[PDB]
Amino acid sequence: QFEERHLKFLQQLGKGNFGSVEMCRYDPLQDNTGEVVAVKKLQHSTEEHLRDFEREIEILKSLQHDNIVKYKGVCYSAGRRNLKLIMEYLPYGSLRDYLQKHKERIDHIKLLQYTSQICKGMEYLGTKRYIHRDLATRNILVENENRVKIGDFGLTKVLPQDKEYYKVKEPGESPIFWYAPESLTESKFSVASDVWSFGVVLYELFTYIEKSKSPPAEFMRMIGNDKQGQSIVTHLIELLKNNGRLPRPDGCPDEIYMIMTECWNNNVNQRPSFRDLALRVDQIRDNMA
Ligand SMILES: CCCS(=O)(=O)N[C@H]1C[C@@H](N(C)c2ncnc3[nH]ccc23)C1
Numbered sequence: 001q002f003e004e005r006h007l008k009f010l011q012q013l014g015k016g017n018f019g020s021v022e023m024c025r026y027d028p029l030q031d032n033t034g035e036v037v038a039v040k041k042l043q044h045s046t047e048e049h050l051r052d053f054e055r056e057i058e059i060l061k062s063l064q065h066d067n068i069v070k071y072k073g074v075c076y077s078a079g080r081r082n083l084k085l086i087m088e089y090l091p092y093g094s095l096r097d098y099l100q101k102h103k104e105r106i107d108h109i110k111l112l113q114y115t116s117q118i119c120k121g122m123e124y125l126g127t128k129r130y131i132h133r134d135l136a137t138r139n140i141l142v143e144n145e146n147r148v149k150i151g152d153f154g155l156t157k158v159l160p161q162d163k164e165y166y167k168v169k170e171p172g173e174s175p176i177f178w179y180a181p182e183s184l185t186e187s188k189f190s191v192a193s194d195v196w197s198f199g200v201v202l203y204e205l206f207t208y209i210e211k212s213k214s215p216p217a218e219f220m221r222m223i224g225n226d227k228q229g230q231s232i233v234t235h236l237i238e239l240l241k242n243n244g245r246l247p248r249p250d251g252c253p254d255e256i257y258m259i260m261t262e263c264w265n266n267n268v269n270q271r272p273s274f275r276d277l278a279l280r281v282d283q284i285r286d287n288m289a
Pocket of ligand 1: 014015021038069087088089090093138141152154
């Protein structure tokens with residue numbers, strides 16, 4: 001149980017259109033010896049966003065896996081109008097920041113160890129028919145030098161039993177440069193669209209988060225200056241339809257780029273499964289040694 005009066009703000013960790021994550025101390029003894037936790041809260045709270053947040057909390061509470069961030073509890077203290085999700089806090093931070101910082105000691109075998117773990121986490125979500133929808137290094141956390149965890153479930157949805165996709169028509173900001181074509185055009189999300197986004201995560205890893213090499217940076221460079229009265233998402237859809245793809249990262253092995261290109265198939269049914277991805281990654285890693 002978490003009492004609101006004992007949560008002490010330390011630092012901001014990240015932001016989403018309607019959500020924010022903060023590093024807080026939970027200090028019931030009020031002597032600064034309390035545990036440091038990660039607190040997720042709604043930015044501009046609504047009755048609709050609260051119900052969605054309740055679902056997100058039920059999703060994370062239902063997950064227990066070595067490569068999934070741990071649920072600690074909730075903090076209401078003021079009915080259902082100031083709901084907070086309490087999670088474990090990982091001092092090493094996001095994989096996005098860690099990779100950039102430690103790019104000299106992180107080798108390809110290490111990148112593939114993280115890749116394998118994300119795949120394992122994703123296969124586990126699949127057993128529960130959960131679609132993550134927002135896979136990105138920004139949302140992956142570093143437990144230690146040999147372990148990562150999927151750390152946010154803000155866009156995660158459960159598939160209904162009757163279909164293999166979830167349709168989401170909703171404002172505002174979508175991570176369009178991580179989205180599968182059918183997610184851009186039909187707002188259709190599936191295990192297959194999470195595989196496409198995984199391909200983009202694999203790309204982020206092998207660029208070591210070089211700012212000018214990010215998926216928005218590369219797609220924008222490919223779209224070019226000829227924007228002339230058309231939106232960026234219109235240009236992106238056309239580019240993907242015409243088989244335009246993110247380039248092979250500098251020093252990335254052909255076999256690893258092949259996995260990315262397979263994830264980025266226009267036909268959802270031709271994309272690999274997360275079990276096949278783990279097999280292929282684990283073996284490329286074993287061969288590197
Ligand atoms: C709201 C949209 C998602 S976001 O803000 O783009 N990414 C999240 C911030 C968080 N993160 C870096 C964390 N850092 C350390 N410990 C942690 N536990 C739990 C989380 C967490 C992932």
